[PDB]
C-alpha cells in the first residue's frame, strides 16, 4: 500500500535530521564534512524572464537563478518534522524558491543558511540592494 517518495541515498541524512535536536546545524555539519547533499529536489522549467525575488507564488527566476518547488527545498518538509517558524506554518510550501546558479549544488543548505530581506524580498548578499 502507498507509494514510495524518497531515495535510499537521502535516507541516512534524513534519519539524522529526524533524530537531532537542531536539524539545521546537523545538516550543515553533514554537508560541510563531505557528505552528499539532498538530491530529489523539484526543479522547475522557466523561461528565465522573472523578477528574481526569493519566494514567490509563481516562478520568477532570472537568467542567473533557478526555480525550485518550495516544499522540496525546505529541510523540515523533506524530513517531515515540525517547522520552527511562526505558528508552525512553513513559508516555503505552496511557493517557489529562487536559488542562485552558483549555489545550485545544495538548495537545502542555501535555504537554511540565508534569509530574505523584509523590505525588497531579495536574498541578502545575493541580489538585495538597500544601501
Amino acid at each position: 500500500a502507498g507509494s514510495n517518495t524518497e531515495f535510499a541515498s537521502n535516507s541516512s541524512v534524513l534519519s539524522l535530521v529526524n533524530f537531532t535536536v537542531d536539524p539545521q546545524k546537523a545538516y550543515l555539519d553533514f554537508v560541510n564534512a563531505g557528505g552528499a547533499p539532498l538530491t530529489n529536489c523539484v526543479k522547475m522549467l522557466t523561461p528565465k524572464t522573472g523578477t528574481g525575488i526569493a519566494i514567490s507564488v509563481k516562478p520568477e527566476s532570472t537568467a542567473d537563478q533557478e526555480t525550485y518547488g518550495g516544499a522540496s527545498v525546505c529541510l523540515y518538509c523533506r524530513a517531515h518534522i515540525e517547522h520552527p517558524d511562526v505558528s508552525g506554518v512553513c513559508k516555503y510550501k505552496g511557493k517557489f524558491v529562487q536559488i542562485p546558479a552558483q549555489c545550485v549544488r545544495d538548495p537545502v543548505g542555501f535555504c537554511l543558511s540565508n534569509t530574505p530581506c523584509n523590505v525588497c524580498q531579495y536574498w541578502i548578499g545575493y541580489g538585495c540592494n538597500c544601501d
Binding site: 531515495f7 535516507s11 529526524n18 546537523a26 523539484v42
Partner: protein, 505 residues
Amino acid sequence: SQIVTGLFKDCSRETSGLSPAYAPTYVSVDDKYKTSDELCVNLNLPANVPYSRVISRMGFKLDATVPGYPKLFITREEAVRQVRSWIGFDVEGAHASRNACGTNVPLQLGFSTGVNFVVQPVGVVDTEWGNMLTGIAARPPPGEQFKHLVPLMHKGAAWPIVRRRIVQMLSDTLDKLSDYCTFVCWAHGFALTSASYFCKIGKEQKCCMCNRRAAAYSSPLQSYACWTHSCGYDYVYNPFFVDVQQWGYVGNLATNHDRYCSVHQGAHVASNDAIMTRCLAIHSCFIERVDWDIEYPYISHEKKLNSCCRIVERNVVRAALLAGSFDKVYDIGNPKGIPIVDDPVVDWHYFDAQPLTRKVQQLFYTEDMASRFADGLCLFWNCNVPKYPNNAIVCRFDTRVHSEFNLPGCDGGSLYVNKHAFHTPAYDVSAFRDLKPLPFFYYSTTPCEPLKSAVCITACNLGGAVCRKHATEYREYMEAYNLVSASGFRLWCYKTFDIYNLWST
C-alpha cells in the same frame, strides 16, 4: 542510483501526486507535471487544497558519520563494555486504517524493567501548511495471536505524558549504573521507528547542574541533564542501539530464548519480549563466548569488597584446613593456581574450566566426578556447580540480593560485574543439600600485645579474656564479613565441621 526506500512513504488513499509547489520530492509529483528532461512545469491548474496525507516513519537508518557526533549503533565489543546500560526494548504496533494504509504506529512499548506503556495511535500528517504529529486511525493487527491487542486500542495515553514517564523510568533504573542508555532490541526496524517518538540525538553534552554526561533533553526548557537532574524532561538524549538478531541468530525470538532459558515464560506482552531479548543478549555475550580481557570501571567500594573477600577466604580456608586435619586440598575453580593459604602445610592441587597456566589442569565439573576428589578437601570459592560434593567448602553469590554490581541475567541467574563480568546461575539451595551453612566465627594466631563472644577462636578466649589486639582484629573482621555477606555471598561447609575442633591452638 535510483533505489527507492519505504521511508516517508505517502500512506494516503489519493491516486494522484501533489502539485510541484507542495510535493516534498520529485517522484512524489503527479506525472501530469513532469517533462522529458526530469523537469517539472506549472500548468496553472487549480490547487488541490486543503489536504491531509499520512507519512510513514518505517525504515530509519542511523548510519551517517558526522564529526563530533557519537556512533549510536554500537558493535558487539562496545555493547559488552556498556553492559550496565542495557535496557531491553520491544514495541507492539497498530496498522494504520481508514484514511491511511501502509504504515504502522507504536501502540505498546515494553522495557526490560517490566514496564509497559500504552499510547494513542499518533503519526505524521502532511498538510498544505506543513506537518503535524497527530492522531491517526489505526486498528490492531489481524489474526488470532494479536487478539490480546484489541482492548489496548482504548487504553492508551497521550505521547507527551508517556515521554516523561519513560524518561522517569529510565532515570529511576539507570541512575546508579551508568551515564548512558543502551536499548537492546531484537529487530530494530520498528524499535528505531518507535524511538523516533521519544529520543533525541546530537553532540555529546554536559549536564546543566553537574559534570555528568547529559542523558536527557527537555524541550520547554531547551536544556540537557543527566539522570539525577532529569525531572520533567521529556526526551532521552543519545541512546545507543543494539540488535541481537545481527549476532548470528536464526529463527524468531521465542525459539532462540527458550533454548537457553526457562524462567521468562508467561503471557505475551511487549515487556516480556524485551526481557527475553535482554536475556538472550546476556547469554550471547557472557555465557557462550566470554572475553576475559575486558575490564569494567569501579563504581563504589569494589576494591574494599575484594579485600574483604580475600580476608574472609583466608580465614575460612585456614580454619577449614586445620579442622579435620586434611592433608590434600583440591581447588576447583582457580584460574591462576595461586595458593590461598600456606600456614598449614598441605598438598595443593588446582583445577579450572579455562586455566591461565599449564600448572592448572582443565576440569569442567560434573557430580559424577565426586569420587575423583573424595580423598581431600574440595574448594568452591566462586565456583558454581549444580551439585557439590560432601567434603566441600563453598562460597556462592546469592543472586536474589540487590546490589550495584549485580545485574539480572540468564535463566534466573545474575551478572556480577566487579572488574570483570561473571555469569552466576540462579541461587538454588537444593545444590547444597549435602552441606551445612557455615556459622560466623574468627580465628587467629597472632601474638598478643571489653569484648564477649564465643566464636572468636583465639588464645585469650581460651582463658575467658580478650586483649586489645584481638579485639580490633575481631572488629575489623566483623566489618569485612558484614560487607561480604551484605554484598550477597553465602558460605557453606561440609557437615562434619565443628568449630570446637579449632580450640587446639
